[PDB]
């Protein structure tokens, strides 16, 4: 068998035992320490796809421990341990999502971890740390992107995804001011994916249309940097996102002079990526980029 799976299994089961003892006994700071160790054990024990159900339960119970340690740390008033616990909760959540896909109680646990990170990101802005702001926004968007796919019907998911989109857009602006562009590209990816799912599942309002515009101009500038770094692979996916967001805005809200400008820029981006994908040989992406390019032209050119 896999001796490391077994050791990680009994080691994580140990930490949960000690944590349930420290909670019963009354010491809180060790319960936060044990939460740190439970999260690292959980996220690593599911770092690749596993079939054993016992592995995914310990991960969920570890997440439950992180959330319990998060609500005690908020009452004691330590902001920095609250931010780290919020980071751990979302990271563990999204790794449980990646491995097990969809079970029943991960929806409510990931929703609780999403609200926790949105609070920490607001609190991280109050402290002024840009590194933690980006990572928390990355997690919020990654988690929100999944929840709206599998749930979608819940009313609270809309607001949390909108707050996550608004959050990653701010984090993508400070990442532009730091200098690192690879982090900007990944934040733009999340901005488009979330913006597209929000318009997909819930339609439009005044705020969704404004946020989607910002996510669209964000991925356009990100794909402009991806062309400078000479990376064909991330370029074609960014062009997909640009067209997708532009398509969801036009087909639901319509277009003004601002939207047609961004749509045209995204359209010339897709035609360049459709050329690069046919060179590299991506049959599925080649025919989806043609679908986008045609659908966007038909909508733009209806007043013509």
């Amino acid at each position: 068998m896999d001796e490391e799976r077994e050791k990680l299994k009994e080691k994580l089961k140990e930490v949960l035992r000690r944590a349930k003892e420290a909670k019963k006994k009354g010491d809180k700071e060790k319960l936060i320490e044990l939460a740190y160790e439970a999260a690292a054990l959980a996220a690593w024990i599911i770092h690749k796809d596993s079939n054993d159900d016992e592995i995914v339960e310990l991960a969920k119970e570890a997440l439950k421990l992180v959330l319990e340690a998060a609500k005690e740390a908020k009452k004691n008033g330590d902001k920095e341990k609250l931010i780290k616990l919020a980071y751990l909760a979302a990271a563990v959540a999204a790794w449980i999502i990646h491995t097990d896909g969809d079970d029943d109680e991960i929806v409510e646990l990931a929703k609780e971890a999403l609200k926790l990170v949105l609070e920490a990101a607001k609190e991280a802005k109050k402290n002024g740390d840009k590194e933690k702001l980006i990572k928390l926004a990355y997690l919020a968007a990654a988690v929100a992107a999944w929840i709206i796919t599998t749930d979608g019907d819940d009313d609270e998911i809309v607001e949390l995804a909108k707050e996550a989109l608004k959050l990653v857009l701010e984090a993508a602006k400070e990442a532009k001011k730091n200098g690192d562009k690879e982090k900007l590209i990944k934040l733009a990816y999340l901005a488009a994916a979330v913006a597209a799912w929000i318009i997909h599942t819930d339609g439009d309002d005044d705020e969704i249309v404004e946020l989607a515009k910002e996510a669209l101009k964000l991925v356009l500038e990100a794909a402009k940097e991806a062309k400078k770094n000479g990376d064909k692979e991330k370029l074609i996916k960014l062009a997909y996102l640009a067209a997708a967001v532009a398509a969801w805005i036009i087909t639901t809200d319509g277009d003004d002079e601002e939207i047609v400008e961004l749509a045209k820029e995204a359209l010339k981006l897709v035609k360049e990526a459709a050329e690069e994908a046919e060179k590299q040989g991506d049959e599925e992406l080649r025919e989806k980029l043609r679908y986008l390019s045609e659908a966007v032209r038909e909508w733009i050119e209806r007043n013509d």
Binding site: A40, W95, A247, W248, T252, K288, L292
Partner: peptide, 19 residues
């Protein structure tokens, strides 16, 4: 030993397209 802190998760799948 003790495993490292949880890394950032992989990116979510691509979103669907309008009808």
């Amino acid at each position: 030993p003790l495993p490292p802190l949880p890394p950032l998760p992989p990116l979510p799948p691509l979103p669907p397209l309008p009808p």
